[PDB]
Every structure is written in C-alpha cells, then in structure tokens.
C-alpha cells in the first residue's frame, strides 16, 4: 500500500537493516504458556491480542516450542477447558529461528517463499553459562513487520 | 534445526532435541536426509516409540553437559558409525544434544578428525553450518585428541 511503492527498490533498501531492527522483543510480545488452558478468558485475550500467530513457550518465555493459530481455536469448546498442549500436540505447528544479524532482504524473500511460514523467531547462542552452548530467543519478526517497514520508507 | 556435515562419504545431521509437540516435522527432516539412526547425547526427554515406527532407531550415548565425551562414548560412537556406513553408506546418522551446539557437534568433530581433518578444519566446517557450535572447553580437548584412522574402512 502506501502508494504502491516499488517493491524492487524497497526490498533493495531492506539489505541495510536486519531483523533486530524490526523485531518485536520477547518481553513485549504476547505469548502463551504450554500449560495454559483454553477457557473463555484465555480465548478472549487471544482474540483481543490482534495476532493470528501466537508464540507458545515452555517454562521460560525464551523457550519457544510451537505456535498457536487463531484457526486452531475455531473448533474448541471454551467450557471444556481444553489444554493448549493438547491442541499443539495435534497441529504440531513448526517454529523457525533466525539470528539477529539476518538482513531483512533475505528474510523478506524467505517469507515470500513460504518455506518457513510468515513468522520467524530471533535467537542467539548463549555461551556464558558453563555447559553446552544453547539457543536463547530474544524476539520475533513477521512478514507484516517487513511490509510496514517497506510502507514507512516510500520516498 | 538440522545441519548436514558430509566428508569422505560419511554424512552427519546435527539436530537439536526433538519434542513431542513437533516430532512429526522432526521425522520428515530425518527422512529427507536419509537418516535411519539418531544418536542422543543428552538426557532422554521425548517418546522414542514414534521414531521406531517410522524406521528411525534411537541410540543413547549421553554424557555430562559441556564436557568432553569419555572414551567409552567415543568408541561406541565410532562403532555405530562404522556399522551404519557398512549397512548403508548413503544413510546419514543424526546426532543431537539439547540444541545441537555442544555434545553433538563434538562427536561429529571427532569423526571428521578420524577421517583426516585437523581439529581446526573440522570445527570450522561445523560452525560454517551451525553457528557457535562448540565451547572453549570442548575445543580444548578437540585440540588434544589424537586420531588413528579408526574410520578407515
């Protein structure tokens, strides 16, 4: 939108930015715990978050394990108090990760290819704590985040 | 999160710990890379029955987190590698610790070293496909490890 900006020119300028420049940090993101139950209050707060793709974590908010789509909630009975884990175990929505220095142009093309979906999570290798190096999620980026970056930048 | 290391016909798939939430997409990544065996070097935390139904066998070779594998683990790891390459040389062997960054890449490094690569070449090859995949302590023992062509034939 924004005047039908040139995607070719806009996507070229995305090379000057990375996912860390447009990502939503994990502290600011709306996320669900794997132990959450899908009663009406939970379903209501999901329906009112405005998001169609809800990150699901296990234990820590940084331990993102899967995704909840609004479509997955269409045929749940809020009186059943269906556990979110039972839903995620059924749909098994995959989750994909990138690094903070991933340039937006490559991320924009990977989103348009559909190989990983339209939401990518941003992780880093934490190698300070003694033991094996482990991944630590710090944020999330969506195709919509890339689109509004293209719209906010028309010359 | 997979990573396919290949050197002199041997193929290694460095994955992370599969979960029961996303085990189906883990199995397809194994089948996509012609993986029949999964070596688990961390503590068991997922159901192994579903993998067995799809033909994927799981071998438990766990050791302490962030350390160097004991000799019994190294010998068994080389033993299972020699068994799978003679059974099907086109078949890749999957290895995973919790995130595929530590104990699993170290076993692959030892195999690459046993095939003719210096430890700095093996580590760089792993990190080329798996960023930050070895800690300094595990590197300190990779540099001291002495190969002897234990994967010659």
Numbering used by the authors:
A (entry chain A): 358 to 512
B (entry chain C): 13 to 165
What does the paper say about this structure?
Despite their relevance in metastatic cancer, much remains unknown about the PRL family.
A truncated PRL construct (residues 10–161) with surface-exposed cysteine mutated to alanine (C104A) was added to the CNNM CBS-pair and the complex purified by size-exclusion chromatography. The complex was crystallized, and a diffraction dataset obtained at 2.5 Å resolution in a P41212 space group. Dimerization is stabilized by hydrophobic contacts between Phe397, Met404, Phe465, Leu500, and Ile504 along with polar interactions such as between Lys428 and Asp249 at the center of the dimer. One iodide ion is stabilized by Lys428 and Tyr426 at the dimerization interface of the CBS-pair domains, whereas the two other iodides bind at the interface between PRL (Arg139, Arg143) and a neighboring CBS-pair from a symmetry mate (Arg372, Lys373). Structural alignments give a RMSD of 1.1 Å for PRLs and 1.9 Å for the CBS-pair domains. In fly protein, both Cys54 and Cys109 are found in the reduced state. Outside of the catalytic site, CNNM Asp458 makes polar contacts with PRL Arg143 as observed in structures of the human proteins. The structure of the PRL–CNNM complex from flies confirms the interaction surfaces are conserved and additionally suggests that phosphorylation of the Drosophila PRL catalytic cysteine will block CNNM binding, as observed with the human proteins.
